[PDB]
Amino acid sequence: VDKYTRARNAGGKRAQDCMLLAAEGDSALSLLRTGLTLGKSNPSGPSFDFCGMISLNKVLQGIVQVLGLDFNCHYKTQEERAKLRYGCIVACVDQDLDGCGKILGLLLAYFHLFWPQLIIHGFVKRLLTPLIRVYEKGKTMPVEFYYEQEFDAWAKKQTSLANHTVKYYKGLAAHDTHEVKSMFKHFDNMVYTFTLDDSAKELFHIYFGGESELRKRELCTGVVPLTETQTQSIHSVRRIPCSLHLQVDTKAYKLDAIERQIPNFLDGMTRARRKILAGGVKCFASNNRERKVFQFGGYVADHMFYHHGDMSLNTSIIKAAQYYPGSSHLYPVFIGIGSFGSRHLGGKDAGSPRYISVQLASEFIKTMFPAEDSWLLPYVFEDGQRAEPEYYVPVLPLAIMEYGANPSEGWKYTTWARQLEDILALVRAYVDKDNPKHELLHYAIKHKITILPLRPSNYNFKGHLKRFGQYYYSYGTYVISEQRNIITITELPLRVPTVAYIESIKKSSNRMTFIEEIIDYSSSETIEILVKLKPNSLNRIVEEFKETEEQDSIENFLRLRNCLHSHLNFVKPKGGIIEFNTYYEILYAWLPYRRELYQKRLMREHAVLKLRIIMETAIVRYINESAELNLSHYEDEKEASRILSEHGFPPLNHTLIISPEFASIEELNQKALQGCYTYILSLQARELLIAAKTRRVEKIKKMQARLDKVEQLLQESPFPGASVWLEEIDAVEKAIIKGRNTQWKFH
């Protein structure tokens, strides 16, 4: 067997004392080799005298061959087990979702399917490695945690983490050489044994069986973290229940795989698209200069922790910067500068990422996603670093205002964008206090009924939308020239590529008996396809493809019909998969999430406003009293701070009060008043002038007026921030109108 290293006693008298270390890949094999050949010191550590290696179907067949297993045996007796060359198999896979959730889960499912008795009595093991290590400055022995719950619980009891650094080891390749030495020093303590319980059989049949309905039922709930009692139990007994592993790690892997293709219902974007939007907001905030697609993709991968390859990242950026009839985004995030694709090839004809550049639609992004509300969203922490937020809460329900189509592993996601006017009317009726049927909409939301209609978006569509039964249909347009005996196709159904449509028409021989030649003469936006028919066939086409009520004979001939199928599957904010029936439900579910955000916005802005008022008042007082103070007479920082303290100047946190980027209201109240005199001692010479003093006084008056206005808005009815919500809705509508007027190029 290739990439297999045997031991001295494998298959010998003490073969039962041997071990087989199943490595995930080449890096795992290198780590195992480094650990095993380490036996020049600490002789108690493992070596090749009893431990072999193997790399992880042909792979499972090889593992069976090295293990000397028999497919016709059940291994219910010790004598039957004695024929095995190795006493146990240990899987050395990484702690990430792809390694321990997929490969280890597949190995466990295979062993349970073929030899359950080996798992029951104990034959399959895994090598737990320290997931998180905390290093103390000056201390040589780190604090090692095997689960994130342990690290979190330990951190809650720590006074301060300033002198502590946290390193996450989710992969076997992330362990340094000295850490590998330390791990293989205690190797005998870090290997656990799998145990099969009663619920484990059912859990295995749910995750790895052919029963898709049970899998969909199981994936409807988020990941359940291991309880502290369970963590203590597994650490004490040195045994992993198979059911617990399947319920935690495999479920997390499956939910992460599904989450990549199915977006949240609050913002209508997946994790990758959320990362891209956050990176675009961060990059183009200072200056909205054009940046190339590969450069911006590198920036996103650097800042928002986008570990996937550059191909998918560049494709997603291009798709987010695309704007053409039938595109996925009716309101794309980025302004495309160059050739980003055409409707004929479905956007796949975009230019190379090295040539096309991307620019952020500042007027649309700054209004739809307010910058002041970005500090209140829950953020995703990747290895201790703050990545993109868990979900965006835009001013309007972006999940239903844009086209979407993404298949999944069993699930289907397909949405057709609703009309902007109807959504705006519904949201305004919900928000506006004095507006017809405003209380009626509240009653409708309370009793889950619909009053105002939602219609599919007819923009960028030179056709007519018709409803029949409970489904929507989009029709194309055609003209007939009897003189030349041709049919000119002027518009295709919604989201139908021109090249794909032509190929589908050509691939049908029956239609080809009547069609002589098809030429694509369409523009970039306008469709013009000339179909030449054979002599004396138009009457035959009408006779064969009989005209029906649903579609005309020509429409049946040319496949000028589309079905607006809608599968409203989305991801809940706290994990899991949620299924909606109508877009009304998505709107009514998204409304409270945004309604609750304005109150937090207003309270945080009130507290921060008080803090800025205090600081600017103190600064203006120092500006007025600088001549009396004569700060240059004092020697160092300590004496200056002391004399500033004698004059009653309050000590404030300069860094946090000015920039409370992610501080809560309680944090602001408890910490912002425990700083130093930097706010005075760091004032520049140009700020001592009368012009700067007058500007600061005017700013203080404006902040006081804004504080009073914030109090009034907090006292507003029905909910705080209703008028602010209406103003933001109007701004978003104006930005969308300006974008649509200028081909989504704000010039």
Site for its own copies in 515-544 (CB under 8 A): 519-524, 526, 528
The Cα 258–Cα 570 span in angstroms is 10
Q: What is the DSSP letter of 649?
A: P
Residue 250's Cα: distance from chain center in Å?
19
**Shortest Å, Cβ 86 to its own copies:** 16
Pairwise CA distance, residues 21 & 42, whole Å: 20
Question: Which parts are annotated binding residues for Mg(2+)?
Answer: 24, 94, 96
Q: Could you say whether residue 327 binds its own copies (CB under 8 A)?
A: no
The whole-angstrom separation of Cα 157 and Cα 593 is: 32
Q: Looking at beta carbons only, is 171 or 225 nearer to its own copies? A: 171
Question: Where in 688-747 is the site for its own copies (CB under 8 A)?
Answer: 688-691, 743
- Of 144-152, 349-357, 507-515, 555-563, the segment contacting its own copies by CB under 8 A is 349-357
Q: Which stretch binds its own copies (CB under 8 A): 126-134, 355-363, 456-464, 588-596?
A: 355-363
Grouping H, G, I as helix, E, B as strand and the rest as coil, residue 583 is helix
Instruction: Say whether residue 175 binds its own copies (CB under 8 A).
Output: yes
Q: How far apart are CA 292 and CA 290, in angstroms?
A: 7
Q: Given the complex with its own copies, which of 176 and 579 has the nearer CB atom?
A: 176
Of 4, 169, 355, 430, the active-site residue reads 355
Of residues 65 through 94, those in contact with its own copies by CB under 8 A are 94
Catalytic: 355? Answer: yes
Which H helix or E strand runs over 319?
helix 310-320
Restricted to residues 609-628, the positions that interact with its own copies (CB under 8 A) are 623, 626-627
Minimum CB distance to its own copies, residue 533 (Å): 18
Binder among 237, 285, 311, 479 for its own copies (CB under 8 A): 311
Question: Taking the complex as a whole, how short is the minimal distance between the CB of residue 352 and its own copies, in angstroms?
Answer: 6
Q: Verify binding: residue 338, its own copies, rule CB under 8 A.
A: yes
Select 110 or 299, whichever has its Cβ closest to its own copies: 299
Residue 147 beta carbon to its own copies: minimum distance, rounded to whole angstroms: 18
Which DSSP helix (H) or strand (E) runs through 638? helix 637-646
Long-range Cβ pairs for the range 284-289 (8 Å, 24+): 284/359, 284/360, 284/362, 288/359, 288/360, 288/362, 289/359
* CA distances, 745 to each of 296, 321, 414, 616 (Å): 19, 11, 27, 40
Residue for token digits 């409708």? Answer: 444
Which residue, 302 or 550, has its beta carbon nearer to its own copies? 302
**Is 42 one of the binding residues for its own copies (CB under 8 A)?**
no
Site residues for its own copies, 290-309, by CB under 8 A, read 292, 294-302, 305-307, 309
Q: Using CB under 8 A, which of 510, 630, 715, 741 touches its own copies?
A: 630
Q: How far is the CB of 655 from its own copies (least distance, A)?
A: 15
What is the phi/psi pair of residue 360, to 5°? -75, 135
Tell me which residue of 478, 434, 425 sits closest to 455, measured CA to CA. 425
Q: How many CB atoms lie under 10 A from the CB of residue 632?
A: 6
Placement of tokens 């998505």 in the chain: 586
Displacement of CA 725 from its chain's centroid (Å) = 26
- Can you read off the two tokens belonging to residue 235? 């650490």
Which region among 34-42, 188-196, 460-468, 469-477 touches its own copies (by CB under 8 A)? 34-42
Binding string, residues 634-653; x marks residues near its own copies by CB under 8 A:
xxxx--x-------------
Based on CB atoms, which residue is closest to its own copies, 38 or 441?
38
Q: Which is nearer to its own copies, 46 or 341 (CB)?
A: 341
Whose tokens are 């280890």? That residue is 104
How many residues at the interface with its own copies, by CB under 8 A? 86
In sequence order, what DSSP letters do the residues of 432-443 get, joined into one string?
A: -SSSTTHHHHHH
41 forms part of the interface with its own copies (CB under 8 A): no
Q: How far is the CB of 3 from its own copies (least distance, A)?
A: 9
- How far CA 708 is from CA of 610, 694, 718, in Å, comes to 11, 21, 19
Catalytic residue ranges:
355
